[PDB]
Amino acid sequence: PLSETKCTLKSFTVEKGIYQTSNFRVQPTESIVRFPNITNLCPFGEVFN
Amino acid sequence: VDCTMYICGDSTECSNLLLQYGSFCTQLNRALTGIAVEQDKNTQEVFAQ
């Protein structure tokens, strides 16, 4: 972070204090999907067998 | 406010297109930091005497 602050402040020397450098965030693992329970199926039995 | 996140909802293409505009996000972040520092200085001058 010392070198990060040096990059941020356009100088090789940084005075004592607080400086904002960048932002941080996380990422989703892969995905997640949720759908309702399967309802009654079409009566394909009387059509096939 | 984070300018990049506000403009683009975690979109790499949107961020890349926004990068072509220049350094507007950095200026806005600096202005917000200056506003926060001004508020802290104001409350310090008002109460801490």
Side-chain angles (χ1 to χ4, degrees), chain A residues 1-26 28-49:
Chain A
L2 172 48
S3 72
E4 208 180 350
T5 310
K6 282 194 236 172
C7 276
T8 307
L9 277 296
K10 300 289 94 175
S11 169
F12 266 50
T13 45
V14 285
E15 293 83 3
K16 169 186 70 48
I18 184 169
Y19 320 99
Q20 298 186 1
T21 72
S22 65
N23 296 295
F24 80 106
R25 59 89 174 173
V26 291
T29 58
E30 67 275 16
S31 161
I32 211 67
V33 54
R34 186 42 71 101
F35 274 119
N37 269 21
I38 295 94
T39 177
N40 162 262
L41 302 178
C42 301
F44 284 117
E46 59 95 15
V47 184
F48 273 82
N49 44 1

Side-chain angles (χ1 to χ4, degrees), chain B:
Chain B
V1 298
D2 192 6
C3 170
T4 298
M5 293 177 70
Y6 177 77
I7 298 285
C8 313
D10 291 331
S11 171
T12 315
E13 310 97 334
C14 179
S15 68
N16 291 335
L17 275 296
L18 178 62
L19 188 153
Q20 285 179 346
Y21 266 70
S23 54
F24 262 103
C25 297
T26 304
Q27 176 204 121
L28 294 174
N29 286 130
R30 183 180 63 242
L32 288 187
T33 312
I35 287 173
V37 171
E38 195 178 31
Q39 297 310 290
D40 282 334
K41 174 201 83 73
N42 285 331
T43 187
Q44 275 281 119
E45 294 293 328
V46 159
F47 274 110
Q49 65 182 177

